[PDB]
Amino acid sequence: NHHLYPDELNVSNNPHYRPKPVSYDSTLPPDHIKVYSRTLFIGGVPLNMKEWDLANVLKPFAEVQSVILNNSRKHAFVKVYSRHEAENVLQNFNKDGALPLRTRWGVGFGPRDCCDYQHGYSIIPMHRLTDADKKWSVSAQWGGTSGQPLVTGIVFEEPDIIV
RNA sequence: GUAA
């Protein structure tokens, strides 16, 4: 809907193919999970710049999956295909300060109040997920667990949702 | 300028 390519699938023959790293963290509290954001907040977006312009300035550092842009408020939310690519953008993109773009972490999944915006992950109690959040976590194309069920300590990348 |  807000994705560049709507119906696409996370498979070998897509050049957008990414693995789904799942790990387990024994320090998380009971019935809690950890989700790494794939969503970037971009502020200072000039009025003349549109969705395609943002996708293209980031292309050297990351393949962009979706852009949601509010030109009036001069910010956008950009989802990239993997955590690694998001981390890559935050270090290496616009180091010179040429573009007026301020790049920070955003949240695409779970409640805002569970997100550490400095490190870009959410420690979420399972009771705060909706039924849809649970479904998307296991069944999403990019991110999620790829069938592995949700249990205490599980760590995955932000799953695609449906909005 | 942290949203759907």
Side-chain angles (χ1 to χ4, degrees):
Chain A
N1 311 308
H2 53 275
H3 289 14
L4 274 49
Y5 310 81
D7 265 26
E8 67 168 336
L9 260 63
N10 189 6
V11 282
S12 337
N13 51 286
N14 196 327
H16 302 326
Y17 178 74
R18 299 291 181 284
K20 295 166 172 195
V22 173
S23 74
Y24 294 85
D25 187 326
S26 56
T27 68
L28 303 190
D31 307 324
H32 283 56
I33 67 172
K34 189 178 174 198
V35 185
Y36 289 112
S37 188
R38 293 190 290 123
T39 299
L40 296 159
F41 174 85
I42 297 177
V45 176
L47 293 162
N48 62 3
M49 278 207 194
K50 313 299 182 168
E51 287 89 331
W52 187 83
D53 292 302
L54 289 167
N56 256 236
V57 269
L58 301 162
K59 186 148 187 135
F61 309 95
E63 209 60 65
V64 168
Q65 179 179 17
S66 69
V67 180
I68 288 168
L69 167 55
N70 185 334
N71 260 302
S72 34
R73 295 173 212 160
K74 296 165 138 275
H75 70 237
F77 300 92
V78 180
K79 209 162 94 176
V80 303
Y81 282 101
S82 72
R83 178 56 176 204
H84 178 60
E85 287 167 281
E87 281 163 11
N88 192 22
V89 169
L90 283 159
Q91 293 181 62
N92 306 353
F93 169 72
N94 203 42
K95 280 170 141 161
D96 60 30
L99 297 138
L101 298 180
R102 206 145 289 284
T103 296
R104 299 286 187 270
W105 285 114
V107 195
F109 179 81
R112 321 300 190 193
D113 64 283
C114 296
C115 185
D116 182 341
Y117 290 90
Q118 243 57 42
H119 298 262
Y121 63 69
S122 299
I123 308 282
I124 313 174
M126 281 162 69
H127 76 90
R128 301 209 47 206
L129 303 176
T130 64
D131 294 321
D133 290 334
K134 292 165 166 170
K135 195 150 162 268
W136 293 324
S137 299
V138 313
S139 66
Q141 289 305 310
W142 279 270
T145 65
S146 67
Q148 313 320 294
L150 294 181
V151 292
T152 298
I154 195 162
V155 183
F156 49 103
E157 301 187 2
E158 176 187 334
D160 299 330
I161 63 171
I162 306 293
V163 61

Short mmCIF file of all heavy atoms in Angstrom, two decimals, chain A residues 9 14 36 46 63 79 81 108 111 134 144:
data_model
loop_
_atom_site.label_atom_id
_atom_site.label_comp_id
_atom_site.label_asym_id
_atom_site.label_seq_id
_atom_site.Cartn_x
_atom_site.Cartn_y
_atom_site.Cartn_z
N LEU A 9 7.49 -10.80 -2.52
CA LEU A 9 7.75 -11.97 -1.68
C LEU A 9 9.23 -12.13 -1.40
O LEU A 9 10.06 -11.90 -2.28
CB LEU A 9 7.22 -13.24 -2.34
CG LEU A 9 5.86 -13.76 -1.84
CD1 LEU A 9 4.73 -12.77 -2.11
CD2 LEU A 9 5.57 -15.11 -2.48
N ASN A 14 14.02 -12.83 -5.86
CA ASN A 14 13.87 -11.38 -5.60
C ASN A 14 15.26 -10.84 -5.24
O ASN A 14 15.91 -11.41 -4.37
CB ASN A 14 12.88 -11.15 -4.45
CG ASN A 14 12.37 -9.71 -4.36
OD1 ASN A 14 13.07 -8.75 -4.69
ND2 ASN A 14 11.13 -9.57 -3.90
N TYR A 36 14.13 -5.72 16.66
CA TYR A 36 15.02 -4.70 16.09
C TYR A 36 14.26 -3.93 15.01
O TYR A 36 13.75 -4.53 14.07
CB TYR A 36 16.30 -5.33 15.50
CG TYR A 36 17.30 -5.88 16.50
CD1 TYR A 36 17.53 -7.25 16.59
CD2 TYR A 36 18.06 -5.03 17.31
CE1 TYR A 36 18.47 -7.76 17.50
CE2 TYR A 36 18.99 -5.53 18.22
CZ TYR A 36 19.19 -6.89 18.31
OH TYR A 36 20.11 -7.38 19.20
N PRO A 46 13.21 18.69 2.61
CA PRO A 46 12.78 19.86 1.85
C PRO A 46 11.45 19.62 1.15
O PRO A 46 11.11 18.47 0.82
CB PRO A 46 13.90 20.04 0.81
CG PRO A 46 15.09 19.40 1.43
CD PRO A 46 14.53 18.22 2.17
N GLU A 63 18.55 -0.65 0.47
CA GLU A 63 17.42 -0.80 -0.42
C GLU A 63 16.16 -0.48 0.39
O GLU A 63 15.92 -1.08 1.44
CB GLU A 63 17.39 -2.23 -0.98
CG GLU A 63 16.77 -2.36 -2.36
CD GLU A 63 17.50 -1.54 -3.42
OE1 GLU A 63 18.68 -1.86 -3.70
OE2 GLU A 63 16.90 -0.59 -3.96
N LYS A 79 11.13 2.41 5.75
CA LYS A 79 11.41 1.05 6.12
C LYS A 79 12.41 0.54 5.08
O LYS A 79 12.22 0.76 3.87
CB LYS A 79 10.10 0.24 6.08
CG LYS A 79 10.04 -0.93 7.04
CD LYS A 79 8.62 -1.42 7.29
CE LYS A 79 8.24 -2.56 6.36
NZ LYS A 79 6.88 -3.08 6.69
N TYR A 81 14.95 -3.07 4.06
CA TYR A 81 14.68 -4.51 4.01
C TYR A 81 15.34 -5.34 5.11
O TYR A 81 14.90 -6.46 5.38
CB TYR A 81 15.04 -5.08 2.62
CG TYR A 81 14.01 -4.79 1.56
CD1 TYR A 81 14.19 -3.76 0.64
CD2 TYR A 81 12.83 -5.52 1.49
CE1 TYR A 81 13.24 -3.48 -0.33
CE2 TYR A 81 11.87 -5.25 0.52
CZ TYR A 81 12.09 -4.22 -0.38
OH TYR A 81 11.16 -3.93 -1.35
N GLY A 108 8.25 0.71 13.84
CA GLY A 108 7.18 0.24 12.97
C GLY A 108 6.32 -0.86 13.56
O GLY A 108 5.32 -1.26 12.94
N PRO A 111 4.17 -1.24 20.64
CA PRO A 111 3.88 0.05 21.26
C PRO A 111 5.10 0.97 21.30
O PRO A 111 6.22 0.50 21.55
CB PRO A 111 3.45 -0.31 22.68
CG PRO A 111 3.34 -1.79 22.73
CD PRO A 111 4.20 -2.33 21.64
N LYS A 134 0.92 -10.66 16.72
CA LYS A 134 1.41 -12.04 16.90
C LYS A 134 1.47 -12.81 15.58
O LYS A 134 2.46 -13.47 15.29
CB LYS A 134 0.53 -12.79 17.90
CG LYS A 134 0.68 -12.26 19.31
CD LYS A 134 -0.42 -12.75 20.23
CE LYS A 134 -0.03 -12.48 21.68
NZ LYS A 134 -1.16 -12.70 22.62
N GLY A 144 10.42 -10.74 11.25
CA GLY A 144 9.66 -11.79 11.92
C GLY A 144 10.49 -13.03 12.15
O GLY A 144 11.71 -13.02 11.98
#
